[PDB]
Design a protein around this ligand. Structure first.
Ligand code: NI
Length: 341
């Protein structure tokens, strides 16, 4: 049955609640972003109104074959009305098309649902600055002080330099980058760009990125693997057997793979700086795990909340265990008491 944290009180609204059939008393279904845990249950046969971003809308039409008359895409940073309730979509700095949702209830309460997000100081100059928030439905994915990671910028700087070095030293080396859902595109595109190559991929994944409105995307991506020296594969294939397999398929066009697994966090971040990362190697294959997160770090999260000073916080992630819930409520109390709200 739909959990309480996916229901917006005093509205007929749900957020990311498509896996519970017809939810009792839901007149409108919100979808923050196109990841499987959140869209789980959508299909062509869905006949309720879905509200989402333009990009998330394109992917619902094309990838899931949802009928067009049920997709209500909304522009960002714009006051819209839905079943007589004022709403706004803000950029979540997650994956493409991903949004946070502000709800202005008729009684005067104001609710921010972050969806999935990576908190940034640039959010403190959106429509969020203008007014108070009573409730915050917070993506608490890395809600613990051990979760630290570098900026997306430094991680990219690392990947670029690394990849440029390897391929200048060996022109017959192939770069491979792992993917399983939309998001993390800057990794593979920045590497392609610095190498003067396009990114080769499967047709299904080429179709997916074509939905997103990237600038000059046709310039960046392709389905001709032969003409490319940056390949994308499923994340599952990023291991020594998978990569040896794929190397075989390229027919003596390459003799070496360098490969990246963009993960969220790894316990190597507790001990090791980004400059100090090294790969796993077996034969002519090297695999780098890099900490490119699309979620808030502990510190970014804490700052975001202390800036916003919400009256109540409802966690949306890691809620399934009593020790987790409890550890989060402790940090929430620290953040409140430190900041004096
Ligand atoms: Ni997500």
């Amino acid at each position: 049955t739909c959990p309480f944290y996916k229901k917006i009180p005093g509205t007929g609204f749900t957020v990311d609640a498509f896996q519970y059939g017809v939810v009792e008393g839901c007149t409108a279904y919100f979808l923050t972003h196109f990841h499987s845990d959140h869209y789980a249950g959508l299909s062509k046969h869905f006949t309720f109104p879905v509200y989402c971003s333009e990009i998330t809308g394109n992917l619902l039409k094309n990838k899931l074959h949802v009928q067009e008359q049920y997709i209500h895409p909304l522009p960002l940073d714009t006051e819209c009305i839905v079943n007589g309730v004022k709403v706004v979509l803000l950029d979540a700095n997650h994956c493409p098309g991903a949004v946070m949702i502000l709800f202005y209830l008729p009684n005067g309460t104001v609710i921010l649902h972050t969806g999935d997000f990576r908190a940034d100081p640039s959010m403190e100059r959106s429509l969020l600055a203008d007014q108070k928030v009573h409730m915050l439905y917070l993506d608490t994915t890395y809600c613990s002080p051990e979760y630290t990671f570098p900026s997306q910028q430094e991680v990219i700087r690392f990947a670029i330099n690394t990849a440029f070095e390897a391929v200048t030293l060996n022109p017959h080396a192939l770069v491979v980058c792992g993917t399983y859902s939309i998001g993390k595109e800057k990794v593979f595109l920045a590497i392609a760009d610095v190498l003067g190559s396009k990114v080769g991929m499967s047709q299904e994944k080429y179709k997916t990125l074509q939905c997103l409105n990237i600038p000059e995307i046709n310039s960046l991506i392709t389905t001709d693997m032969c003409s490319s020296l940056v390949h994308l594969l499923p994340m599952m294939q990023i291991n020594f057997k998978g990569l040896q397999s794929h190397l075989k398929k390229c027919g003596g066009k390459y003799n070496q793979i360098l490969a990246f697994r963009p993960t969220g966090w790894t316990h190597s971040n507790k001990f090791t700086r980004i400059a100090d990362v090294i790969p796993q190697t077996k034969g002519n294959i090297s695999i780098y795990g890099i900490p490119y997160s699309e979620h808030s770090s502990y510190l970014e999260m804490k700052r975001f909340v202390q800036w916003l000073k919400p009256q109540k916080i409802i966690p949306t992630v890691n809620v399934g265990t009593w020790k987790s819930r409890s550890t989060m409520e402790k940090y929430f109390r620290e953040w409140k008491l430190e900041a004096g709200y």
